[PDB]
């Protein structure tokens, strides 16, 4: 997250860190949202590589013992069947991970609430992106979870020529684009949390930013629209 602030330890308890085995260590690569005690929602592009993955729930600082972490291996991966790694603009950037164990819930570990199917936020709806992604374009990952306030940009504006044009689809949510704050590499797969009727719900799965930079004016961060996949998610969990 570029232009973010440090999140309070218990603000976003559904946020997880998706990590891969690297030598004799683990490295964060993407975020995710805990949606069942044994299921995580992330971006399909985060699991394109055939690596060993684990999820960390109750994580706050990637480099220090928080005293709240639960480490769980990824036992099964179900990527959306229409995802194509060489066509992120087509959408479908979503995947579900079944965990080897069911995590224990507490104030640092809770399920993410999803929006009702088909819900579309009005332009300029207030949301926060959270993640440990780069804090500057071509920078480094954050040590502590960051949050940035990114208002939505509706489809009509987002798909206009000066914004994302034909790249953005109605199956995506755009947010931000002020040139100061945004998601960045390493935030992919994580949540876009938006307050609706007094409750936050996870409306987006971070998918992509501009090749010209994370924080670029009129290139809002683009997320997979969770509300376009409610039936898909329910169907995967029920058959797995
Ligand atoms: Ca930690
Ligand atoms: Cl949360």
Swiss-Prot record:
- Where do the Peptidase S1 domain residues begin and end? 1-238
Keywords attached to this Swiss-Prot or TrEMBL record, sorted alphabetically, are: Calcium, Disulfide bond, Hydrolase, Metal-binding, Protease, Secreted, Serine protease, Signal, Zymogen
Location in the cell:
Secreted
The protein's required cofactor(s) are namely: Ca(2+)
From the Swiss-Prot or TrEMBL record, what is one GO molecular function term?
Answer: metal ion binding
Query: Catalytic activity annotated for this protein?
Result: Hydrolysis of proteins, including elastin. Preferential cleavage: Ala-|-Xaa
Respond yes or no to whether keyword Magnesium is given for this record.
Answer: no
What are the catalytic residues? Answer: 45 (charge relay system), 93 (charge relay system), 188 (charge relay system)
User: What's a single GO CC term here?
Assistant: extracellular space
The first-level EC class reads: hydrolase
How and how many cofactors are bound, per the record note?
Answer: Binds 1 Ca(2+) ion per subunit.
Q: In which tissues is it expressed?
A: Pancreas. Basal layers of the epidermis, hair follicle and sebaceous gland epithelia (at protein level).
Which SUPFAM superfamilies does the record match to this protein? Trypsin-like serine proteases
Q: List the disulfide bonds.
A: 30-46, 127-194, 158-174, 184-214
The catalytic activity of this protein is classed by the Enzyme Commission as 3.4.21.36
Q: Which residues bind Ca(2+)?
A: 59, 61, 64, 69
- Listed GO biological process terms: proteolysis
What PANTHER family does this protein map onto?
CHYMOTRYPSIN-LIKE ELASTASE FAMILY MEMBER, CHYMOTRYPSIN-LIKE ELASTASE FAMILY MEMBER 1
Role description: Serine proteases that hydrolyze many proteins in addition to elastin.
Q: What's this protein's family per the entry?
A: Belongs to the peptidase S1 family. Elastase subfamily.
Q: What is this protein called?
A: Chymotrypsin-like elastase family member 1
């Amino acid at each position: 997250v570029v232009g973010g602030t440090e999140a309070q330890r218990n603000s976003w308890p559904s946020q997880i860190s998706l990590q891969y085995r690297s030598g004799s260590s683990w490295a964060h690569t993407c975020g995710g949202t805990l949606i069942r005690q044994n299921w995580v929602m992330t971006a399909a592009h985060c699991v394109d590589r055939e690596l060993t993955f684990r999820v960390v729930v109750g994580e706050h600082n990637l480099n220090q013992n928080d005293g709240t972490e639960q480490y769980v291996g990824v036992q099964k991966i179900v990527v959306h069947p229409y995802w194509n790694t060489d066509d992120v603009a087509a959408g479908y950037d979503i995947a579900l991970l079944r965990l080897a164990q069911s995590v224990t819930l507490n104030s640092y570990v809770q399920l993410g609430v999803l929006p009702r199917a088909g819900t579309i936020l009005a332009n300029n709806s207030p949301c926060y992106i959270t993640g440990w992604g780069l804090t500057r374009t071509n920078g480094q990952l954050a040590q502590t979870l960051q949050q940035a306030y990114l208002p939505t940009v509706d489809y009509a504006i987002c798909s206009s020529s000066s914004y994302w044009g034909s790249t953005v689809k109605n199956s995506m949510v755009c947010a931000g684009g002020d040139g100061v704050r945004s998601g960045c590499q390493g935030d992919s797969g994580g949540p876009l949390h938006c307050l609706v009727n007094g409750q936050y719900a996870v409306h987006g799965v971070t998918s992509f930013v501009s090749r010209l930079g994370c924080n670029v004016t009129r290139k809002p961060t683009v997320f997979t629209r969770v509300s376009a996949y409610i039936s898909w998610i329910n169907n995967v969990i029920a058959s797995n």
